[PDB]
Coordinates of C-alpha atoms and ligand atoms in Angstrom, one line a residue:
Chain A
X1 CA 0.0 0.0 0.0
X2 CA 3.1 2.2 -0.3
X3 CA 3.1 4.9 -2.7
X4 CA 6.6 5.4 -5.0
X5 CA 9.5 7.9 -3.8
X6 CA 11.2 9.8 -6.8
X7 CA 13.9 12.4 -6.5
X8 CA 14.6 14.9 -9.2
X9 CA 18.3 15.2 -9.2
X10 CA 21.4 16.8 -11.1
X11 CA 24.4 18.8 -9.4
X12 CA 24.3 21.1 -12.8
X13 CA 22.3 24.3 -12.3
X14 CA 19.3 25.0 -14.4
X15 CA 19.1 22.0 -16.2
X16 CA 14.7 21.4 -15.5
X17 CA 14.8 20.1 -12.0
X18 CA 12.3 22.0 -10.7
X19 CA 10.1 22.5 -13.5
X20 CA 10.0 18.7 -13.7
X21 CA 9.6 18.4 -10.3
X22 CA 6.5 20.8 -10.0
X23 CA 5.1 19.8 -13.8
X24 CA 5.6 15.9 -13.1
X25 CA 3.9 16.1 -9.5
X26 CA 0.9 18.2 -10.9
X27 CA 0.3 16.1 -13.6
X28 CA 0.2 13.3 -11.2
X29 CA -2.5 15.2 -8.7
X30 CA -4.6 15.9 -11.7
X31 CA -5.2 12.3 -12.4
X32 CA -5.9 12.2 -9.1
X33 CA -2.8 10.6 -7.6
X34 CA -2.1 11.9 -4.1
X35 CA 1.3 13.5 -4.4
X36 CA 3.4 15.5 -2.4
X37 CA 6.1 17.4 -3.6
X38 CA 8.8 18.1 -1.3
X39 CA 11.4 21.0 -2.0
X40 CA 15.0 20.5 -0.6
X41 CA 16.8 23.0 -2.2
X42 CA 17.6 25.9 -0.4
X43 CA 16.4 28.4 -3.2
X44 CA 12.6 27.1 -2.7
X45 CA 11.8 27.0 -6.6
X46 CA 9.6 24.1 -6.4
X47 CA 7.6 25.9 -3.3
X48 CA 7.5 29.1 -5.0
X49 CA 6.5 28.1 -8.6
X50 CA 3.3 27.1 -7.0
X51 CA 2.6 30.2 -4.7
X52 CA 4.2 29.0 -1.2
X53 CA 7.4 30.6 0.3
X54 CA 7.5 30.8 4.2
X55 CA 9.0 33.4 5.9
X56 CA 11.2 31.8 8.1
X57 CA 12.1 28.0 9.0
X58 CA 8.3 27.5 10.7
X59 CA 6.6 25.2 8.1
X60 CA 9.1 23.9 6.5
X61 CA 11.3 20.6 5.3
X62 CA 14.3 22.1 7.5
X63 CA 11.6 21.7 10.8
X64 CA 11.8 17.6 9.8
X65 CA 15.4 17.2 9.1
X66 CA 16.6 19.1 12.4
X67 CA 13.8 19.8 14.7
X68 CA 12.1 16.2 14.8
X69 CA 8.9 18.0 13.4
X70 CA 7.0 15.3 12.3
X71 CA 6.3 16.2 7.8
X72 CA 2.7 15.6 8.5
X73 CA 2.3 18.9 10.0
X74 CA 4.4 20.5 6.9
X75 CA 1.6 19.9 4.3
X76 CA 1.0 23.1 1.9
X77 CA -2.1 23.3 0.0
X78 CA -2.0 23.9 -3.7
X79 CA -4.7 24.6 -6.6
X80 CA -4.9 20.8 -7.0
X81 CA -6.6 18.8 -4.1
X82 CA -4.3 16.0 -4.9
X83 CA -0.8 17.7 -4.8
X84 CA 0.2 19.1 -1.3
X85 CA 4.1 20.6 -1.0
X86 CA 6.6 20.6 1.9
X87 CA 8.1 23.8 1.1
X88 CA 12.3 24.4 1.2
X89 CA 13.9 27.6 3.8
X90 CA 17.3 29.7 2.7
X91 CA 18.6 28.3 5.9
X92 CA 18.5 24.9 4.4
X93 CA 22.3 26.2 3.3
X94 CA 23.1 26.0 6.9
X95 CA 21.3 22.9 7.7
X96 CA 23.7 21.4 5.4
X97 CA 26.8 22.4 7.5
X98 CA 24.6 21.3 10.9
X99 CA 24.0 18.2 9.7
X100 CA 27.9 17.4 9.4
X101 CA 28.2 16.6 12.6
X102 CA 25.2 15.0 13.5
X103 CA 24.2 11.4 13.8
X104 CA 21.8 9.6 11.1
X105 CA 23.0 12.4 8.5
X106 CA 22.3 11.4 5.2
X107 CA 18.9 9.7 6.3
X108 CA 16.9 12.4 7.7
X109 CA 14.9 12.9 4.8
X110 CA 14.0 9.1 4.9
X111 CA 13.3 9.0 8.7
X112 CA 10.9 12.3 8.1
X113 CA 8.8 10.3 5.5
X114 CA 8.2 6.8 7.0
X115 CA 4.8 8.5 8.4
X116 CA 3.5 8.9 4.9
X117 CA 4.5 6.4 2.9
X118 CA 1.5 4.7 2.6
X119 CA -0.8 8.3 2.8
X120 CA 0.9 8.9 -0.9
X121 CA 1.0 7.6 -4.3
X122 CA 3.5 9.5 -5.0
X123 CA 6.7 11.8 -3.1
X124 CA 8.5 13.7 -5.5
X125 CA 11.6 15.6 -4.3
X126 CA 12.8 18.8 -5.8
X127 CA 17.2 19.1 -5.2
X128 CA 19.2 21.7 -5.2
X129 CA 22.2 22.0 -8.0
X130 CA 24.5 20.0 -5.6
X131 CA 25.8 16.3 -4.3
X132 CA 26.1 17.8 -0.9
X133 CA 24.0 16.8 2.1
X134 CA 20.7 18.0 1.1
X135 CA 21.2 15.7 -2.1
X136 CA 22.2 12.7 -0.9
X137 CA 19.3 12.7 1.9
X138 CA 16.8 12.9 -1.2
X139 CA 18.8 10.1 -2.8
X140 CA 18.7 8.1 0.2
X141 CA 15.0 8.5 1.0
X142 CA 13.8 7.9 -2.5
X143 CA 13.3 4.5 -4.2
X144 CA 14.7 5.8 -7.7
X145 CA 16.0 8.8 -9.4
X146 CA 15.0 11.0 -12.0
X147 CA 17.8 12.4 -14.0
X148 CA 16.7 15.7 -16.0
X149 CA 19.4 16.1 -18.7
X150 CA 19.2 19.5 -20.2
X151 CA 20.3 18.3 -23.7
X152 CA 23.5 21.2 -23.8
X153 CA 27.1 20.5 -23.6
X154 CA 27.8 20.9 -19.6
X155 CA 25.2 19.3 -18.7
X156 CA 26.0 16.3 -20.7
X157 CA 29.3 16.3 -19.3
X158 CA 28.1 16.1 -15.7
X159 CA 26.3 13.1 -16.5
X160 CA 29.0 11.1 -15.5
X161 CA 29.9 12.2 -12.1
X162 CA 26.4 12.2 -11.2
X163 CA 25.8 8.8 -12.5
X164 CA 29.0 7.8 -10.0
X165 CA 27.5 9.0 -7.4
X166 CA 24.4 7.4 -7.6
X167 CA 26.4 4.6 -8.1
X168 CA 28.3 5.1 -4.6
X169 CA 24.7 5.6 -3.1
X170 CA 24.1 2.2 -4.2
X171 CA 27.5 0.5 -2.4
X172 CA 25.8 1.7 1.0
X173 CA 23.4 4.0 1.7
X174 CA 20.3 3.0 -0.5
X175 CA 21.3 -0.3 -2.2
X176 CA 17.5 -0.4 -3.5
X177 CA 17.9 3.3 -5.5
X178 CA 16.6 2.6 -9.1
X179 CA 17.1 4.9 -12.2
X180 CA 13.6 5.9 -13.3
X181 CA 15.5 7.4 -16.1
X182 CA 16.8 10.3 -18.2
X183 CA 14.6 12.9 -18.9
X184 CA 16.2 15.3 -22.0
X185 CA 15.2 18.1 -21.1
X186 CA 15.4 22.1 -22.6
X187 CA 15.6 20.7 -26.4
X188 CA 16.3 22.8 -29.1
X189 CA 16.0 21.5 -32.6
X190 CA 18.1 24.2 -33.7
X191 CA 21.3 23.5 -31.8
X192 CA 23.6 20.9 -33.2
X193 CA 24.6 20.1 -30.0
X194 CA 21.4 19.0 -28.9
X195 CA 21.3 16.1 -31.7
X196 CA 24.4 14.9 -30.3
X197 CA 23.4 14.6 -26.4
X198 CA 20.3 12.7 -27.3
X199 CA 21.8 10.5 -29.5
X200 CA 24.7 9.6 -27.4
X201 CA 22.7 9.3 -24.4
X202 CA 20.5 7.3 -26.2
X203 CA 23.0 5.0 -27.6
X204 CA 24.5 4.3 -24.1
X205 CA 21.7 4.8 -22.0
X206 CA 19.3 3.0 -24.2
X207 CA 15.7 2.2 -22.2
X208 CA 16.6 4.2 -19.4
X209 CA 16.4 7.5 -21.2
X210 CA 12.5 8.5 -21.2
X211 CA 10.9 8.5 -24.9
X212 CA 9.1 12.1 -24.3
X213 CA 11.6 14.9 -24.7
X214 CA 10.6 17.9 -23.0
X215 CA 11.3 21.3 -25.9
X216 CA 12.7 24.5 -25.0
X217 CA 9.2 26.4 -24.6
X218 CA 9.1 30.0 -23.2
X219 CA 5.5 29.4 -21.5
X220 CA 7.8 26.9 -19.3
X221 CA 9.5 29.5 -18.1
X222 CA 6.5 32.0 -17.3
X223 CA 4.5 29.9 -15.6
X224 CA 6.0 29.7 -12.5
X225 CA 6.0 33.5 -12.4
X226 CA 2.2 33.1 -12.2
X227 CA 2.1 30.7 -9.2
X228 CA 1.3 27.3 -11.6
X229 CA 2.3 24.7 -12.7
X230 CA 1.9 24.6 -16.7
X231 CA -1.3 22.0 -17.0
X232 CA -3.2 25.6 -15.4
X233 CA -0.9 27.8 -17.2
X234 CA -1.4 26.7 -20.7
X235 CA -2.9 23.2 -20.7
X236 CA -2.2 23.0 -24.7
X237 CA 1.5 23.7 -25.0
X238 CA 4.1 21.6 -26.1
X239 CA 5.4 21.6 -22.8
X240 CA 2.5 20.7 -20.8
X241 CA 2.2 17.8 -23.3
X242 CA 5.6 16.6 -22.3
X243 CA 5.0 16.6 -18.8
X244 CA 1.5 14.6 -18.9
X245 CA 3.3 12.4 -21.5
X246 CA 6.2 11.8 -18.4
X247 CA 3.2 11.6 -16.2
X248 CA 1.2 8.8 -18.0
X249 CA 4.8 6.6 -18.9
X250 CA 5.1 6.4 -15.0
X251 CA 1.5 5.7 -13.9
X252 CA 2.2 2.9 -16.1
X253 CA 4.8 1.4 -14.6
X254 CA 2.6 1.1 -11.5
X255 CA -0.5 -0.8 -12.9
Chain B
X1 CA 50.2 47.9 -8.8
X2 CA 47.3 45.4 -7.1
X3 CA 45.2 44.2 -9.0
X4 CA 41.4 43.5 -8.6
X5 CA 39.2 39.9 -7.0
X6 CA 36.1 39.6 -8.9
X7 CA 33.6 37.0 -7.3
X8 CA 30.5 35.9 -10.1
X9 CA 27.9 34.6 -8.1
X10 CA 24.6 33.4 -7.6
X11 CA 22.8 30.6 -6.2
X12 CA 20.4 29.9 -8.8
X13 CA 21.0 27.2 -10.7
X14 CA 22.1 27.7 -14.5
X15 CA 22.2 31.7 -15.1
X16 CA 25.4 32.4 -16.6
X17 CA 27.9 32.7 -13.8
X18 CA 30.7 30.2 -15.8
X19 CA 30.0 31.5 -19.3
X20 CA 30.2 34.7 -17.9
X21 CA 33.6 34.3 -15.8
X22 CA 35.1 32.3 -19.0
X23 CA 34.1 34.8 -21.6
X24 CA 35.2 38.1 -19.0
X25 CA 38.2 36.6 -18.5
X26 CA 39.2 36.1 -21.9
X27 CA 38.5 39.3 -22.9
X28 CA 40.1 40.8 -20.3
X29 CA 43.2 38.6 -21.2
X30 CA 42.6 39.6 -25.0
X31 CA 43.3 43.2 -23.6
X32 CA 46.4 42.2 -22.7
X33 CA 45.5 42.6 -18.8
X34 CA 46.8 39.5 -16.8
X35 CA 43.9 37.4 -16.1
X36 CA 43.8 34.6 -13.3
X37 CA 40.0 32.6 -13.6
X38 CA 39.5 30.1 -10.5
X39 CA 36.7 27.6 -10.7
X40 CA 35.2 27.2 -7.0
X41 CA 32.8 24.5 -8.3
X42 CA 33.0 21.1 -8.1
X43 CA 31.3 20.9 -11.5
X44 CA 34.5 22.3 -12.9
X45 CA 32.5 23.9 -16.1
X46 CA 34.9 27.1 -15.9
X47 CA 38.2 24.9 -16.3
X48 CA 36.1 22.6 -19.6
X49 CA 35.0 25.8 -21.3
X50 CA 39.0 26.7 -21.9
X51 CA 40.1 22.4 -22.1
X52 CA 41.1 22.1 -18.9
X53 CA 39.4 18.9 -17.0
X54 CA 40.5 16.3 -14.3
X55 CA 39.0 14.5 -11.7
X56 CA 41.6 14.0 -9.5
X57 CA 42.5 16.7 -7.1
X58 CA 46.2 17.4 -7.4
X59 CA 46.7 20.9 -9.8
X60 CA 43.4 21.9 -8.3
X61 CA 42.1 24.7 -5.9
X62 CA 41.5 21.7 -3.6
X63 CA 45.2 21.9 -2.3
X64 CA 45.1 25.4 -1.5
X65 CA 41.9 25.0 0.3
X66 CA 42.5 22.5 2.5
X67 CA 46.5 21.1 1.8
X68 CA 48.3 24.3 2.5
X69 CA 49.4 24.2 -1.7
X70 CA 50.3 28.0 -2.7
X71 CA 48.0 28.8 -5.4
X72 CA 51.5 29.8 -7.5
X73 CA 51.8 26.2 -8.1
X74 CA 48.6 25.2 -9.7
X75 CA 48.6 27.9 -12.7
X76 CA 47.4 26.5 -15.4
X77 CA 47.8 27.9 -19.1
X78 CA 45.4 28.2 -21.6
X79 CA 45.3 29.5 -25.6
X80 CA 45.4 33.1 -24.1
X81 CA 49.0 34.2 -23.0
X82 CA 47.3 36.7 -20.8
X83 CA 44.8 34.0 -19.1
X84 CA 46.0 31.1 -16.5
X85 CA 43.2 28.8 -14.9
X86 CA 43.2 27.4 -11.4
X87 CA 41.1 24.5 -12.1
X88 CA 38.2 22.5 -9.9
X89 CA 37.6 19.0 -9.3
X90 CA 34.4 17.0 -8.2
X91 CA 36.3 16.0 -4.8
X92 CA 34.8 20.0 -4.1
X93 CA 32.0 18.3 -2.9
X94 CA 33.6 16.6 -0.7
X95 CA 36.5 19.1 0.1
X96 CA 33.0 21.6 1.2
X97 CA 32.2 18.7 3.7
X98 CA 35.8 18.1 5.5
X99 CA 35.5 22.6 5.4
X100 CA 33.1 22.6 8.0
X101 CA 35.3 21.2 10.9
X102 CA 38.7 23.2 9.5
X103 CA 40.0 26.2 11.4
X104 CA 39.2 29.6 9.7
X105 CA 37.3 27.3 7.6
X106 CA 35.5 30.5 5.3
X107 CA 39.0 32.1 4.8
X108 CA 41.0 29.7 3.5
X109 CA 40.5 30.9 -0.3
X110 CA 41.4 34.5 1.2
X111 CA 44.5 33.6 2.3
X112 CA 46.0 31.5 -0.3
X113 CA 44.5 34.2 -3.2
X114 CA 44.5 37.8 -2.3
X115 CA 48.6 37.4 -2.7
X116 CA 48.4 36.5 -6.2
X117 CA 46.7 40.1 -6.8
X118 CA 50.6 41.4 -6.8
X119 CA 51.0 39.4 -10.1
X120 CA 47.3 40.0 -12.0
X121 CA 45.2 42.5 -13.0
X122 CA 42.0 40.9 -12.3
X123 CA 41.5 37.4 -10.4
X124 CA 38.2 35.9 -11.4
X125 CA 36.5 33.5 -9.4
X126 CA 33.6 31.3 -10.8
X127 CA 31.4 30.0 -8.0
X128 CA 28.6 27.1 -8.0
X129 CA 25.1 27.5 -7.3
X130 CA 25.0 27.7 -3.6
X131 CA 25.7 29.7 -0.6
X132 CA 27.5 27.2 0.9
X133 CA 31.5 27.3 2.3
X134 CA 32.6 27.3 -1.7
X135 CA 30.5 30.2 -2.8
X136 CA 31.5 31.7 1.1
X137 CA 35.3 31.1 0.4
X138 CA 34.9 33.2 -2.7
X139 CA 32.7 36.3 -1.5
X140 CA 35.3 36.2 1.9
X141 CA 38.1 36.4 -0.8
X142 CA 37.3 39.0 -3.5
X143 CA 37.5 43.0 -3.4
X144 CA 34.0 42.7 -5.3
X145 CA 31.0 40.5 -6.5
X146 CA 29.8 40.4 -9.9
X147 CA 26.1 39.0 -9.9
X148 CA 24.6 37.6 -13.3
X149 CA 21.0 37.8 -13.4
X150 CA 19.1 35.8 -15.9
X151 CA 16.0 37.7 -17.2
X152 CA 14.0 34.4 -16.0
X153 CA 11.5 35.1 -13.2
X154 CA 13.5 32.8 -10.7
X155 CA 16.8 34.0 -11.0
X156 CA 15.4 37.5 -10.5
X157 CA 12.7 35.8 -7.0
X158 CA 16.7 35.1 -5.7
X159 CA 18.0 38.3 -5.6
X160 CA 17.1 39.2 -2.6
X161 CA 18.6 36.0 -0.9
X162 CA 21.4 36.4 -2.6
X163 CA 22.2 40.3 -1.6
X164 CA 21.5 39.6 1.9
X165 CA 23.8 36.7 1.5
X166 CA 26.5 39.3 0.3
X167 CA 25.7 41.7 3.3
X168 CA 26.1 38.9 5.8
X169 CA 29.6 38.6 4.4
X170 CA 30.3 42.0 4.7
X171 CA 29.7 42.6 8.3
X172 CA 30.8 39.6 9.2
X173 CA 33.7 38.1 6.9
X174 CA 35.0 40.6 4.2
X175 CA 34.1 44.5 5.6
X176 CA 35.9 45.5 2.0
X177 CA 33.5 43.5 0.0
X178 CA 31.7 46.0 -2.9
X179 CA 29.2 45.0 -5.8
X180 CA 30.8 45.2 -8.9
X181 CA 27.9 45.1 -10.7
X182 CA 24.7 43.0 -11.9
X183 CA 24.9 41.6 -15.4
X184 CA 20.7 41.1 -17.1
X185 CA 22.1 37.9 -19.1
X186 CA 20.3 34.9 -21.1
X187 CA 18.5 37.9 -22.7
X188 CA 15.3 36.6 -25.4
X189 CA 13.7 39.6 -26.1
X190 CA 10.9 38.4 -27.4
X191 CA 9.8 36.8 -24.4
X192 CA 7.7 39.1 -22.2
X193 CA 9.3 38.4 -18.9
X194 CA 12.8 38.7 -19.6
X195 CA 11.9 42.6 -20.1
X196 CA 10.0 42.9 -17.0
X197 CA 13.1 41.2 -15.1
X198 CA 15.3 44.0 -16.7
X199 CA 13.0 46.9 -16.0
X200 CA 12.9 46.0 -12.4
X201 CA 16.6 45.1 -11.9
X202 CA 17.4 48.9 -13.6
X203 CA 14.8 50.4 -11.4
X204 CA 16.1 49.3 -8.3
X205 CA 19.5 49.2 -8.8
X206 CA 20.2 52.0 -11.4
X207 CA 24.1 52.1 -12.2
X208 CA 24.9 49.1 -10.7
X209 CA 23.3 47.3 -13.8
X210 CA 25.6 47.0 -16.2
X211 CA 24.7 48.5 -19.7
X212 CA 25.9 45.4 -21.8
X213 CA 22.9 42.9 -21.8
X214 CA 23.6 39.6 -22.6
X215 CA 21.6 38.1 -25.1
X216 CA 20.9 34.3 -25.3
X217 CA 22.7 33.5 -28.5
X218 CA 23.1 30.0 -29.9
X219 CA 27.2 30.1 -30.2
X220 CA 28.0 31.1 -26.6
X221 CA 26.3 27.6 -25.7
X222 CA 28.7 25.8 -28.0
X223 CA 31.9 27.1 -27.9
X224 CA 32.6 25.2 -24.4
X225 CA 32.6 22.1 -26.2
X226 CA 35.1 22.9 -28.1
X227 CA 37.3 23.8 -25.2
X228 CA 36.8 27.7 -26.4
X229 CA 35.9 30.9 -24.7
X230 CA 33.3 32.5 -27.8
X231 CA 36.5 35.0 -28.7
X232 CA 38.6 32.2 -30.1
X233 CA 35.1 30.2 -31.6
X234 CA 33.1 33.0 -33.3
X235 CA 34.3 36.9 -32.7
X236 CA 31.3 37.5 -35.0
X237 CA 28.6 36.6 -32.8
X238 CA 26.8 39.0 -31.2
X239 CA 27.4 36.7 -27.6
X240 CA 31.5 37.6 -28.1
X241 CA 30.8 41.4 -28.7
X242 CA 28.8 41.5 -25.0
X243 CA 31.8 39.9 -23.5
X244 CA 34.2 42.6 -24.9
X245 CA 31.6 45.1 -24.1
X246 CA 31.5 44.4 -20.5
X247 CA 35.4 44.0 -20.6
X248 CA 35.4 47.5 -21.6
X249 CA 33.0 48.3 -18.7
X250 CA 35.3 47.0 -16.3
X251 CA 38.2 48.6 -17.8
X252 CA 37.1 51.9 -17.1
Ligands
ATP1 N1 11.8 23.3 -21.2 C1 12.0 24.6 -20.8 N2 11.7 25.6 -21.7 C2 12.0 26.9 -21.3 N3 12.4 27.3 -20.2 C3 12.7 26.3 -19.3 C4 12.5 25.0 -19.6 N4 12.8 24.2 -18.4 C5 13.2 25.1 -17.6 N5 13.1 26.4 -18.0 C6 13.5 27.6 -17.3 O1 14.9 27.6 -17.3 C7 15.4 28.0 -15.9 C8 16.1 26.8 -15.3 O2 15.1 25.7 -15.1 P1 14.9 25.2 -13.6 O3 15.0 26.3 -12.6 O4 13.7 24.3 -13.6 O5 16.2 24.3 -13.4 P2 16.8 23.6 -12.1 O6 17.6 22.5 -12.5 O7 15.7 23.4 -11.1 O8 17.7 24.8 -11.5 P3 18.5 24.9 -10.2 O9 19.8 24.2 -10.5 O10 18.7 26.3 -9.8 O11 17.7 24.1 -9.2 C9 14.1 28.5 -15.2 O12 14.0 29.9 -15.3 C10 13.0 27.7 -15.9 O13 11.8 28.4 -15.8
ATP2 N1 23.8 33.9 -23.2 C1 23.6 32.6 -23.4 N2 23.0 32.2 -24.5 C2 22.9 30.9 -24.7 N3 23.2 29.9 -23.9 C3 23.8 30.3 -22.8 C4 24.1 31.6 -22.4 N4 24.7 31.7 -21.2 C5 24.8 30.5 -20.8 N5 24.3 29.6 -21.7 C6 24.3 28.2 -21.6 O1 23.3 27.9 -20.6 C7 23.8 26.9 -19.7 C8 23.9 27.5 -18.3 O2 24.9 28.5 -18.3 P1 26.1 28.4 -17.3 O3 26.5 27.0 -17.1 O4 27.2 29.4 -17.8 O5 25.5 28.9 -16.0 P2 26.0 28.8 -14.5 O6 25.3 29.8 -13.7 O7 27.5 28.8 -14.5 O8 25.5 27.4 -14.1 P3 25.8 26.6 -12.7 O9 24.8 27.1 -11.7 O10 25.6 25.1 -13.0 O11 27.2 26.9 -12.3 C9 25.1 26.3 -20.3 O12 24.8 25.2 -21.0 C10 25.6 27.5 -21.1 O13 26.4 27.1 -22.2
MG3 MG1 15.6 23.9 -9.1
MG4 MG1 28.7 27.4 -13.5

């Protein structure tokens, strides 16, 4: 009866974490999965892109991973019944550094979601551009990984340290962590490098690269500005498609 | 004759802090002003863009951080006489980790660096996307902060944080610390945001906006793949005449 844990993760910055964090966990709530999206990044993207930002630590994931506050009483309300969010806290930066030297460290995000495992289909967790701390608790809590792969030349180049580390994660601290697979992400037909990440990625990566490819679309980008996620943005854009296409290719995998 | 520690930061993920320190730094070398670009991120994008890549930590900025290494020793050159690289590796990460039980921990960029200022005209230091003991290392170290600002509505939502951030550092770490200025980059001007983000950034915080805007520009996005700042892969793109544009800037 336990719903699925997925963590959106890539230590490259602005690659489509967090829009496929928010736009993967609302097209889930609108076919009326419960999902919660939890933001553990300290800049609070995936919180704000759907109208929540907290004023100070009260209400927030850094309450769970230091305070012992149990995540139940963290739940955000959005515009979708079926998607509630635990919303991220600048001082994450410094929960980082606190959690150092502390006991348990790298499986305070797990510990904080045992209470809800079996309240949610889904947990999808937003991380910051980073393998640090905050990272590797998502990693550890989550039963696989969702790699967004913005299909441009650094990003492609990261690929490899990231895969490594998922790969240490899996010598010790969550054996179990699956790749859910490669999202290519922020296509651009008109940019030869694009051709080239997809098709080497898909040549070595093979079935765990998603089919859908989410394009480079500007109403991406301007939704978040407004508070919502895309499917209540602009429900017929390219984009929107993408991320109900992502949506549908993992509700299958659950049937 | 000291010269001048730039810091390019901002926490946001992907808004043209390494294509900006590569391409500034290459003009500024072009200039013939000696040009030292340090990569403070364990992604190590600033060292690919000019060819420069390792994993392993020895060469890197990892010594002087946390191994007592003199910075003179891990100069690295590049195709531009006037430009050297101190290069990242991934270890970062884990070099950010063993940082928070070090002595001094948030200078230890500061005093390895700042000497180095008797030999260049501008240090440049690239910093990831965080506010973490890297990105603190480089604000405690530099005699300003240069913040690029992609016209994207979350870059500009981080702002805020990332000022206050850079206040902190001044009363606390680095009383010297000044703003060099914000750069409005990843321009699309026919997207009806990006101007809004540029209106309010020039409302608020007038001359401190740079005039050069950099536009998003299909070259500047390929030239690190060749191993190339976008002066020595395509002087005829409108992306390499920003970069000599805010060189001049600076300049004066
Ligand atoms: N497919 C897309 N088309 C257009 N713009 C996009 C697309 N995906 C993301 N963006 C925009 O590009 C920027 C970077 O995306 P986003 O913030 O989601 O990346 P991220 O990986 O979460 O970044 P960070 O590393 O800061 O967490 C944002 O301003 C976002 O709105
Ligand atoms: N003006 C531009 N036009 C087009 N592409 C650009 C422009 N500036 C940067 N890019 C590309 O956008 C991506 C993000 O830029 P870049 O990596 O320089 O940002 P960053 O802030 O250094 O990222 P990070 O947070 O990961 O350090 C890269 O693939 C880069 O090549
Ligand atoms: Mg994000
Ligand atoms: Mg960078």
């Amino acid at each position: 009866g336990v719903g699925r844990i997925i963590c959106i993760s890539n230590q490259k910055g602005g690659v489509g974490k967090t829009t496929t964090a928010i736009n993967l966990a609302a097209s889930l709530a609108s076919a009326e999965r419960r999902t919660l999206l939890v933001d553990m990044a300290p800049q609070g993207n995936a919180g704000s892109g759907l109208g929540i930002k907290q004023d100070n630590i009260t209400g927030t994931i850094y309450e769970a991973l230091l305070n012992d506050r149990p995540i139940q009483e963290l739940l955000h309300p959005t515009e979708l019944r079926y998607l509630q969010v635990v919303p991220a806290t600048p001082d994450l930066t410094g929960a980082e550094v606190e959690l150092v030297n502390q006991d348990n460290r790298e499986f305070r995000l797990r510990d904080a979601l045992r209470p809800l495992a079996a309240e949610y289909d889904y947990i999808i967790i937003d991380c910051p551009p980073s393998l640090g701390l905050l990272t590797l608790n998502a990693l550890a809590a989550a039963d696989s990984v969702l790699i967004p792969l913005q299909c441009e030349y650094y990003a492609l180049e990261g690929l490899s340290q990231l895969t490594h580390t998922i790969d240490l994660v899996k010598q010790g601290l969550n054996p179990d962590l699956k790749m859910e697979g490669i999202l290519l992400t922020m296509f651009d037909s008109r940019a030869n490098i694009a051709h080239q990440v997809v098709e080497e990625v898909r040549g070595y990566f093979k079935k765990q690269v998603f089919e859908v490819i989410v394009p480079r679309n500007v109403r991406l980008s301007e939704c978040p500005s407004f508070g919502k996620p895309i499917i209540l943005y602009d429900i017929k854009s390219k984009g929107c498609e993408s991320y109900l296409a992502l949506g549908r290719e993992l509700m299958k995998r659950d049937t």
